[PDB]
Design a protein around this ligand. Sequence first.
Ligand code: HEM
Ligand code: CYN
Ligand code: XE
Ligand code: XE
Ligand code: XE
Ligand code: XE
Length: 121
Amino acid sequence: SLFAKLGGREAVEAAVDKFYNKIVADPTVSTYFSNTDMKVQRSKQFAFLAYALGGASEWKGKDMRTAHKDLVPHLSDVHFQAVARHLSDTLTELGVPPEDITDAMAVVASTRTEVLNMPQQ
Ligand code: HEM
Ligand SMILES: [C-]#N
Ligand SMILES: [Xe]
Ligand SMILES: [Xe]
Ligand SMILES: [Xe]
Ligand SMILES: [Xe]
């Protein structure tokens, strides 16, 4: 699985950690997390990514749409692209093969419609 390919528990823990260090340092998105526990958020993101990356069989948290839909200001592609870029940058700095970054980005991108509370067409 992508999860195992990336390096497993340890790699993903490092990615999520370094990823969120960028999140709070970016005024484009940091404000959304002002009232958030960033350690709990680290926990949740790992659990979801692990599932999304094929490392876990279940995701028990909130569905992406429910999770972000009521955030203000309404999430657009400016925030989604920032988050994507931050993860890409994260993995690149963690020494991940570019082809692996391609697959992980694809998994993250596949959550666009729900995360952005957009019409399913
Ligand atoms: C791009 C793909 C994204 C993924 C895969 C993702 C993943 C997650 C996950 C797993 C949660 C936990 C939900 C729960 O409570 O079970 C969450 C919540 C949250 N997300 Fe995201 N997210 C994404 C995009 C974004 C973006 C673009 C923003 C804003 C710029 C954002 C801000 C937040 C906030 C503020 C929460 C709730 C924090 C809290 O409960 O205090 N997310 N997201
Ligand atoms: C972003 N969680
Ligand atoms: Xe990773
Ligand atoms: Xe990741
Ligand atoms: Xe990440
Ligand atoms: Xe993410």
